[PDB]
Amino acid sequence: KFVEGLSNNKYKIITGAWAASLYGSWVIVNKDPIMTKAQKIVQARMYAQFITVGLLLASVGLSMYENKLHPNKQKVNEMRRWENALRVAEEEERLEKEG
Amino acid sequence: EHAEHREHLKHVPDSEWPRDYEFMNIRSKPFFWGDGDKTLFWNPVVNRHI
Amino acid sequence: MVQRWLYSTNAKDIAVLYFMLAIFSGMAGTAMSLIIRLELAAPGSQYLHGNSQLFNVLVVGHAVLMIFFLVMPALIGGFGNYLLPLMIGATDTAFPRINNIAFWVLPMGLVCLVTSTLVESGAGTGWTVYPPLSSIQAHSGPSVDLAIFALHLTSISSLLGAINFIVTTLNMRTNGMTMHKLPLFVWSIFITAFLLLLSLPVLSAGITMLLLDRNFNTSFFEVSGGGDPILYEHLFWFFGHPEVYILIIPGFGIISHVVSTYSKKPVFGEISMVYAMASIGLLGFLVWSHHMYIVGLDADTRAYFTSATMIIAIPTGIKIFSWLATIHGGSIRLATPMLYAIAFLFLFTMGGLTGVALANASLDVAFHDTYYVVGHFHYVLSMGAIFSLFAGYYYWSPQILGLNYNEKLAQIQFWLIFIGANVIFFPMHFLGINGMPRRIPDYPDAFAGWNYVASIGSFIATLSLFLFIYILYDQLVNGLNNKVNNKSVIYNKAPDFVESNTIFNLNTVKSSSIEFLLTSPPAVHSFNTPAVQS
Amino acid sequence: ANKVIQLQKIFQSSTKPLWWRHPRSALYLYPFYAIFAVAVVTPLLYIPNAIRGIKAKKA
Amino acid sequence: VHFKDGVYENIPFKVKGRKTPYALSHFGFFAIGFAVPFVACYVQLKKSGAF
Amino acid sequence: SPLHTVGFDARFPQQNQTKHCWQSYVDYHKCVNMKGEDFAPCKVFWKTYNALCPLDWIEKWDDQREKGIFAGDIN
Amino acid sequence: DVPTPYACYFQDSATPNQEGILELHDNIMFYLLVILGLVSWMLYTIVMTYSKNPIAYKYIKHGQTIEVIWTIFPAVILLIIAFPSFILLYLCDEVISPAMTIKAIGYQWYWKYEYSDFINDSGETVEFESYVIPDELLEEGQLRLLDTDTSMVVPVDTHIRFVVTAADVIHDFAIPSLGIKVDATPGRLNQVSALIQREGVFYGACSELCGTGHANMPIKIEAVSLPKFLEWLNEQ
Amino acid sequence: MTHLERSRHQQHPFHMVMPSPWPIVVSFALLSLALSTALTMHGYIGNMNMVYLALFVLLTSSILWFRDIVAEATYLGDHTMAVRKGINLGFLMFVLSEVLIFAGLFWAYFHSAMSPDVTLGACWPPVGIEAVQPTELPLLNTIILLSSGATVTYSHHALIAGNRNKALSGLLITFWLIVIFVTCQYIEYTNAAFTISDGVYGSVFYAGTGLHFLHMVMLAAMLGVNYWRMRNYHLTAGHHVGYETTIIYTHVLDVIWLFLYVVFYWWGV
Ligand code: HEA
Ligand code: HEA
Ligand code: CUA
Ligand SMILES: [Ca+2]
Ligand SMILES: [Cu+2]
Ligand SMILES: [Mg+2]
């Protein structure tokens, strides 16, 4: 139901989730200060991209959760585009024959 | 299973090769090394210019 | 003698090597412009026997030499490396071997540009080396490769110097100088170095992409293969507008010093000038497609780009109104840097007003690739940046050389270049508004009338350049006698109206920067103990 | 093998330039000047043929 | 290195004590720069048969 | 007036019209497999691509569809 | 329609686009002349009354009640010059119901025109290449570097759509009195429109550096009435 | 300390570098490299011996420059706290410049992919191009980079913690994992279907990941020189700045490899 509705927002949610994981892990790594700021940045970033690559293999898991919905896309709405581009040539051909 | 795919691809001669599209293997000038058409990591099994 | 100048590691020596190379390459670019303008004087072939390729190669050499080999190594390379350590109280720059290689990679760019001219036909492509003309089909041979390597070595120099500048003014400021208490020229070099650091990568990427397209059979901008030259236009001009703000921001700093010391009153609202320069530098990255109004963008693309190109007239207007406010109510001492600064304040505003005429994409369909654009940018270049460069030379030369120049000859030189530059670049608007295109060696006969008067003005400009060469000779030979006789201005500030001539003598220099307090020609170890500031 | 104090006592108490102060510097510095001297002047010899238009022999 | 101070010691070129006139060095430094595009013009016109 | 031309299309109402002639070309040549001969509105595609797409591109694409190197789906 | 010697203004308009471009340029130049008169009057009066001033008012640094004014006033003059510019920008882009398409393909140092509408009785596409008349074969009276051997002929009072592309390098289809300037890049097809309001002949040139024949690459458009256009097209 | 003895030092914390030949030597090496490649690209020079000699001279001159930097930092004691802060800031501006180079390359990929041409077929990846699948070897290449960062983090913090064997071993594991990544990229480049001449796809793909490949081989080189200087006791527990710059370099090459991964291998397939 919801699955493709935010699975074409797929690579726009995971970069936001990366930014969320780094800028959220930043306060948890910065609340206990004795390291210099660079070590806090590299450890928060080290956690955050483990999160984004785990979420990205969950991304391919969703990708084949989701297209047992309708098989063989990358063409079955080039079907859509070409089918109504076709008979929108039809809508012009008629009333230039009869207009 | 990709080395074995290259293994069975080594038995397909170049008239049975798919014809290159217009953008494939751009040859503006020949490469200044070697024999011309071969690039820097040109594996002759997976790459063929006919 | 070989360790001081070949193995050099002090910034004040690398600065004068930068200056010698800059004025040499400026003589080269002025000779190239004299040949261009002499060929353009009348219809038909005049001096180059047909041969429009040689004309195009000379236009390329003129633009590249004057931008990347005169104005950048003059302003940034000479004046920044000399004065920013002296005005923040640094003993030297941070990373000085970087500072030496950033000079010595410039003669190598020069020799590869000159042999780019001497091989098969030269690279006649414009200074914006657009594919597919700059490709291997339309330009066969090593000409464009060597021009691209010239751009690479100049970008290496201006990136290493930018890193050097950023670190040496964020790290080596003297012990009272917060960032708000910086001189305006230091803020100029600072913001310029950030623009360099943020913009030179995309240029290096684009012209390395072009070089791989030419020689390594790859297709970034090859249409039969999947490319697009509009990608080159984007990647170039994302550098190309930050480049022209890089050319002008140290000029703004030099003018803000000169105007204040010859009005004898401080700059009206200094921190708003810093904010204005930072806003120009920030907004210069958002305007790059005003050079691409014709290529076929959307209407909303062009609407945003007219809006963003228009709203940079606000901080430049703040700067220019602040310059008028800091000469209002002053005691103007009409010396040669002051003459150059007032000429800047007039001619730069005329160039900027033609710039806001060009900012409208609705209107730029009438003016793109015409001589109107040539008029706009040669105003704000050869009357903005060159006038601020001459102002910086006449403002700092006797201090940092120890030798005064002839004042009457300097004012003759100023009036000749101010006449001659106007006579070159003012009729170009007439030609461009009547439809005369760019980069043509020959034109229809109806354009002869203003082209003749422009090339007459070209000789006035190069005559004033020859006069400037003689002024340098007279400064280097008779510069110790110009202090003794009355051929020069010894003090750039007169006494105040109730200040005695003897009470002036204990406080001869009244400056807000360290540069005019130092020993003339400054010591090899200035600031043994650090300078101190409240 | 922790020669750093023994090398500090050489590098600080020396008259020679900094790239010459190590004992093994004559092994690096003398070949490099020959390799550098041929590497910078051999393209300059090919500059006139590139101006004239003479390509090298390959076949 | 400790370097010399003074008025003429900040420039790589010699001005005062010379066995040749300084205007030689000064104006031949700039005439070469003014004459690079003419060498360029000469060789690219001799390559195109105009001479 | 006997003068009639391609009108503007809501898919491509901007300045660049490359995917007008390319789309009408691929739409015409993927008519005649699914549609066939003598079909009355595939001359709409024909007038649209031959009115605004240049001759070099038309003969290049027809050569490429005889190659098997055409990058559209007309089979 | 043609440049004149010693001219200083636009060529005479022939389309509504160019006649709007002229009005927007003059409207911008109005406020530009206001600002130029202001700053040149200040720059004159300051250096003519304070060059002979021996006491400098060295305590004027802030000016709070007027810095906001000279920040605000440039912004409203930008708004005033930007109001008609957006209207012209969003008026010149629509190409609505044109009665003619013409393709113009820039090759290296000729243009190639192609009427592609099959309104002919021949029914075939009309193309021709238009080269510059060289200087040695100019018969007497012809305009140097502007005249061509063949011409592009267009009817008047007709919405025409120019579809512009190139073949090898970037060119520019530019005619100033019609007020069209459009880049011909070798990958894509741009379009502009025009409505020619008066008959005549209008010249233009390649305004993009094509190489060594860049100056020798002109455009010539004869706008005629529609009968004469039809009888021209009946041959070629 | 007394005034008489304080006067025998510098009064300011900054390194006044001695005059050095390597700026002009590297400049002439870049000249010879440019003039050699521009003439071997067009056949005016027979073979690649001039380009090989020029690159060798360039590399050895950079090595002698870095040797002098090591000598100044270790055997003369010239790197104070202000000099350390300046070197770290200069390396940060450097990595910002290289991130901007990669942003230009990502702009090239996106301008080719956001709306592709008609000569590829309004398609991405283009027709006939067999794209590299993101699951097999590039997944291992992400894993051995996220793990290389985790190794160099404990190697660093054990260098601070007084441990010697736990830092040398972590540095050795980091260096070997980086060369594992470089050999896996070589294996992918050999067993890749498309080449750099196969259109704009091969152009942008090999441009981005080959620039990353070159940065990784320089990363392996500087991890090696850090291992050398840690084994030979140059690096100390409080003053290890070249090591810190290498750690910054690993952690920015990690995130730009991730952007290359998710763009060139997931969104672009
Ligand atoms: C730095 C910018 C700069 C400067 C100063 C100039 C200066 C001049 N330029 Fe030009 N020009 C360009 C930048 C500049 N130009 C660019 C970017 C192009 C585009 C190329 C292209 O289209 O691709 C161009 C193209 C261009 C054209 C358009 C031709 C064409 O489109 O093909 C013309 C027209 O005649 C021209 C002529 C001149 C003339 C007569 C001068 C005269 O003003 C020269 C007189 C100036 C001086 C005499 C300056 C003083 C000399 C010094 C050396 C200063 C020394 C002082 C110190 C060191 C303190 N140049
Ligand atoms: C010295 C560098 C420099 C500077 C400072 C500028 C300043 C500006 N330039 Fe220019 N420009 C170039 C260098 C520069 N330019 C170059 C080299 C080219 C051609 C490149 C090529 O094609 O080869 C070019 C071309 C160029 C184009 C491309 C046109 C084309 O190629 O078809 C445009 C488009 O908008 C433009 C606009 C502007 C604007 C709006 C400013 C503004 O920043 C100017 C701001 C100043 C003022 C506006 C005047 C002062 C303000 C007031 C008095 C306040 C009151 C005024 C108003 C409210 C308007 N110029
Ligand atoms: Cu076609 Cu210029
Ligand atoms: Ca002429
Ligand atoms: Cu701009
Ligand atoms: Mg253009």
DSSP result, C28-44:
HHHHHHHHHHHHTTSSS
d(CA C463, CA C434): 30
F4: left (phi over 0), alpha (psi -120 to 50) or beta: beta
Alpha helices in H75-198 (DSSP H): 81-113, 137-160, 165-190
Domain count, chain C: 1
Radius of gyration, alpha carbons of chain F: 13
Q: How far apart are CA C301 and CA B50, in angstroms?
A: 44
Helices and strands: H and E segment counts in chain A: 3, 0
Is residue H107 less than 8 Å (CB to CB) from chain A? no
Which amino acid appears at position C49 of this protein?
H
Report the C-alpha gap between G200 and C530 in whole angstroms.
77
Residues from chain C contacting residue E2 (CB–CB below 8 Å): 524
| Partners of residue B20 in chain F, C-beta under 8 Å | 69
Method: cryo-EM
Cis peptide before C242 (omega within 30 of 0): no
Whether residue C343 contacts residue C383, with contact meaning beta carbons closer than 8 Å, is answered with yes
Three-class DSSP category at G166: strand
The owner of tokens 């521009």 is: H38
Tokens representing residue B6 in the block: 């290259």
Domains and CATH numbers, chain G: 16-92 (1.10.287.90), 100-235 (2.60.40.420)
Please confirm, yes or no, whether C92 is among the known catalytic residues. Answer: yes
| CA-atom Rg of chain D in angstroms | 21
User: Among this protein's residues, is C455 annotated catalytic?
Assistant: no
Q: What is the CATH number of the domain that holds E17?
A: 4.10.49.10
Which helix (DSSP H) or strand (DSSP E) does residue C276 occupy? Answer: helix C270-283
Determine the distance separating the centroid of ligand 5 and the alpha carbon of C59, expressed in angstroms.
19
Residue C300 annotated to the active site: no
Alpha helices for chain D (secondary structure H): 4-11, 25-52
- Among this protein's residues, is C7 annotated catalytic? no
Cβ separation G103–F56 shorter than 8 A: no
Number of domains within chain E: 1
CB contact under 8 A, H146 and A53: yes
Q: How many domains in chain F?
A: 1
Q: Buried (b) or exposed (e) across A36-54, using 16+ Cβ within 10 A?
A: eeebbbbbbbbebbbbbbe
What the block records as the tokens of C285 is 């990255």
**Calpha distance H182→H140 (Å, rounded):** 12
Q: Can you give the C-alpha Rg of chain H in angstroms?
A: 22
Interchain CB distance below 8 Å, A97 and F30 = no
Residue D47 sits at the chain C interface (C-beta within 8 Å): yes
Triad C338, C342, C343: Cα angle to 5°? 115
- A90:F41 CB<8 A: yes
C92 close contact with H: CB closer than 8 A: yes
G211 closest CA partner among G119, G117, G121, G108: G108
Long-range Cβ contact pairs of G179-183 (< 8 A, separation 24 or more):
G179/C365, G179/C366, G179/G13, G179/G15, G179/G17, G179/G18, G179/G19, G179/G21, G180/C365, G180/G15, G180/G17, G181/C294, G181/C365, G181/C366, G181/C368, G181/C369, G181/G207, G182/C294, G182/C296, G183/C294, G183/C295, G183/C296, G183/G208
Cα of G164 vs its chain's centroid, Å: 15
Tokens of B45: 């099994």
**Closest Cα to atom 7, ligand 1: which residue?**
C382
Phi first, then psi: give them for residue F12, nearest 5 degrees: -135, 75
Q: Which domain holds residue E36?
A: 1-51
CA distance H241 to H78: 13
Task: Look up residue C224 and give its amino acid.
Answer: S
Mark the residues whose beta carbon lies below 5 A from ion ligand 6: C 369; G 208
G218-224 sheet: strands from edge to edge: G152-155, G218-224, G200-205
Q: Do chains B and D touch (3 or more CB pairs under 8 A)?
A: no
Question: Shortest Cα distance from C138 to chain G (angstroms)?
Answer: 8
Q: What's the domain range around C361?
A: 1-484
Burial class from Cβ neighbours inside 10 Å (0-12, 13-18, 19+) for residue C96 reads buried
* CA C339-C395-C172 angle, 5° bins: 140
**CB within 8 Å: C224 and B29:** no
How many whole angstroms separate alpha carbon C366 and alpha carbon G214? 19
Q: Is residue C282 a part of any domain in this protein?
A: yes
Query: In chain C, what residues touch H104 (CB-CB under 8 Å)?
Result: 201-202, 205-206, 235, 238
Best probe of the F interface among A79, A84, A86, A91, by most F CBs < 10 A, is A86
Residue nearest to atom 2 of ligand 2 (CA): C244
| Cα–Cα dist B41/B34, whole Å | 12
Pocket of ligand 2 (CB under 6 A): C 128, 244, 247-248, 290-291, 309, 312-313, 316-317, 320, 349, 352-353, 355-356, 358-359, 364, 368, 373, 376-377, 380-381, 384-385; G 35, 39, 74, 77-78
Cβ burial H37-66 (10 Å sphere, 16+ → b, else e): bbbbbbebbeeeebbebbbebbebbeebbe
- Helix, strand, coil shares of chain C as percentages rounded to 5? 70, 0, 30
Distance (Å) from the alpha carbon of H146 to chain B's nearest alpha carbon:
26
**What one-character DSSP code corresponds to residue C266?**
-
Alpha helices in C67-183 (DSSP H): 72, 81-87, 96-104, 106-118, 143-171
Q: Does F14 touch chain C (CB under 8 A)?
A: yes
Name the strand (E) or helix (H) holding F62: helix F55-67
Ligand 1 atom closest to residue C428's alpha carbon, by position in its atom list? 34
How far is the centre of ligand 5, averaged over its atoms, from the C-alpha of B13 (Å)? 55
Whether residue C126 contacts residue C236, with contact meaning beta carbons closer than 8 Å, is answered with no
Measure CA of the first residue to CA of the last residue in chain G; give whole Å. 24
Of the candidates H202, B33, H34, the one whose C-alpha atom is nearest the C-alpha of residue C218 is H202
Q: Please provide the distance, in angstroms rounded to a whole number, between the alpha carbons at the two ends of chain D.
A: 55
C188: annotated active-site residue: no
- Distance of alpha carbon C433 from alpha carbon C428, whole angstroms: 8
Write down which chains contact chain D via at least 3 CB pairs under 8 A: C, H
Rounded to 10 deg, the angle between the E22-46 and C11-39 helix axes is 50
Q: Which of G160, A18, H194 has its CA nearest to residue B26? A: H194
Rounded CA gap, C382 and H86, in Å? Answer: 36
Contact between G163 and G104 under an 8 Å Cβ cutoff? The reply is yes
Pocket lining: C63 vs ligand 1, CB cutoff 6 Å: yes
Q: What angle do CA C215, C220, C222 make, to 5 degrees?
A: 80
Query: CB-side exposure of C385: number of CA atoms within 13 Å?
Result: 24
Can you read off the two tokens belonging to residue H95? 């990595």
Q: How far is CA G94 from CA C207, C377, H81, in A?
A: 36, 32, 64
Three-state SS letters, C290-355: HHCCCCCCCHHHHHHHHHHHHCCHHHHHHHHHHHHHHHCCCCCCCCHHHHHHHHHHHHHHHHHHHH
* Domains, chain H, with CATH or none: 1-78 (1.10.287.70), 79-269 (1.20.120.80)
User: How large is the C-alpha radius of gyration of chain G?
Assistant: 24
Residue F50 at interface with chain G, using a CB cutoff of 8 Å: yes
CB C427 within 8 A of CB C387: no
- Residue C319 and residue G65: Cα distance in Å, rounded? 17
Contact predicate G221/G192, CB 8 Å: no
Within 13 Å of residue G56, how many CA atoms lie on the same side as its CB? Answer: 26
Q: Tell me how far the alpha carbon of residue C305 is from its chain's centroid.
A: 25
Query: E15 with E8: CB under 8 angstroms?
Result: yes
By alpha-carbon position, which residue is closest to atom 35 of ligand 1? Answer: C37
Give the amino acid at H51: V
Phi-psi map region of C217: left, alpha, beta (phi>0 left; psi -120 to 50 alpha): left
Identify from C104, C164, C288 which residue to disrupt to test chain H contact, counting H C-beta atoms within 10 A and taking the largest count: C104
Interface residue C524 vs chain F (CB under 8 A): no
Of G99, A86, G120, the residue nearest F6 (C-alpha)? G99
The atom of ligand 3 lying closest to the CA of G206 is 2
Question: Is the CB of residue C126 less than 8 Å from the CB of residue H47?
Answer: no
Angstrom distance (rounded) from CA H49 to CA H39? 12
Closest atom, ligand 1, to C-alpha of C67: 1
CA G27 from centre of chain: 17
Q: Which two tokens stand for residue C340?
A: 């150059």
- Chain-centroid distance, C-alpha F28: 5
Question: How much of chain B is in helix, strand and coil states, percent to nearest 5?
Answer: 15, 0, 85
Give the DSSP H/E element, type plus range, for residue H248: helix H241-261
Give the rounded distance of the alpha carbon of H224 from its chain centre.
13
**Rg of chain B on CA atoms, in Å:** 13
Is there a catalytic annotation at residue C316?
yes
Report how far ligand 1's centroid is from the alpha carbon of C309 (Å): 24
Determine contact, residues C450/C391, Cβ cutoff 8 Å.
Answer: no
What distance in Å separates residue C220's CA from the closest CA in chain B? 11
Torsion, Cα of E3, E7, E9, E15 (10° steps): -170
Tokens (6 digits) for G207: 């305004």
| Of C116, C117, C134, the residue nearest H38 (C-alpha) | C116
Whether residue C332 and residue G9 make contact (CB cut-off 8 A), yes or no, is: no
Which residues of G carry a binding-site annotation for Cu cation? Answer: 171, 206, 208, 210, 214, 217
Q: Assign E3 to helix, strand or coil.
A: coil
- Cβ contact C473:E27 at 8 Å: yes
Domain coverage including residue F26: 1-75
Radius of gyration of chain C (CA): 23
Q: Is C181 a catalytic residue?
A: no
Sign of CA dihedral H24, H28, H29, H31: positive
Q: Is C291 a catalytic residue?
A: yes
Instruction: Identify from E22, E44, E45 which residue to disrupt to test chain C contact, counting C C-beta atoms within 10 A and taking the largest count.
Output: E44
Which H or E element spans position G174? Answer: strand G171-175
What separation, in Å, do the N-terminal and C-terminal C-alpha atoms of chain B show?
26
How far apart CA H197 and CA B23 sit, in angstroms, is: 8
Task: Round to whole Å and give the CA distance between E28 and C17.
Answer: 17
Q: Is residue C500 part of a domain?
A: no
Burial of H214 (0-12, 13-18, 19+ CB in 10 A): exposed
For residue G206, give the ligand nearest its CA: 3
Tokens of A63: 């990708």
Is C231 within 8 Å of H111 (Cβ atoms)?
yes
Nearest to H227 by CA among H214, H239, H242, H217: H242
Sign (positive or negative) of CA dihedral C414, C416, C422, C428? negative
**Placement of tokens 């390098």 in the chain:** G169
How far apart are alpha carbons C356 and C309 in whole angstroms? Answer: 8
How far apart CA C480 and CA A26 sit, in angstroms, is 64
Burial class (CB in 10 A: 0-12, 13-18, 19+), C512: middle
Give the 3-state secondary structure of residue G129.
Answer: strand
- The CATH number of residue C197's host domain is 1.20.210.10
Distance of CA C117 to the CA centre of its chain: 23
Give Cβ neighbours of residue A53 (< 8 Å, ≥ 6 apart). H142, H146, H258
Q: Are C268 and G46 in contact (CB under 8 A)?
A: no
CA atoms within 13 A on the CB side of H140: 11
Q: Quick one: three-class SS letters along C44-78?
A: CCCCCCCCHHHHHHHHHHHHHHHHHHHHHHHHHHH
Among all bound ligands, the one having the nearest atom to the CA of C244 is: 2
How many whole angstroms separate alpha carbon E33 and alpha carbon C24?
Answer: 6
Across C171-224, the runs of DSSP E, i.e. the strands, are none
Residue C501 tokens read as: 């001539």
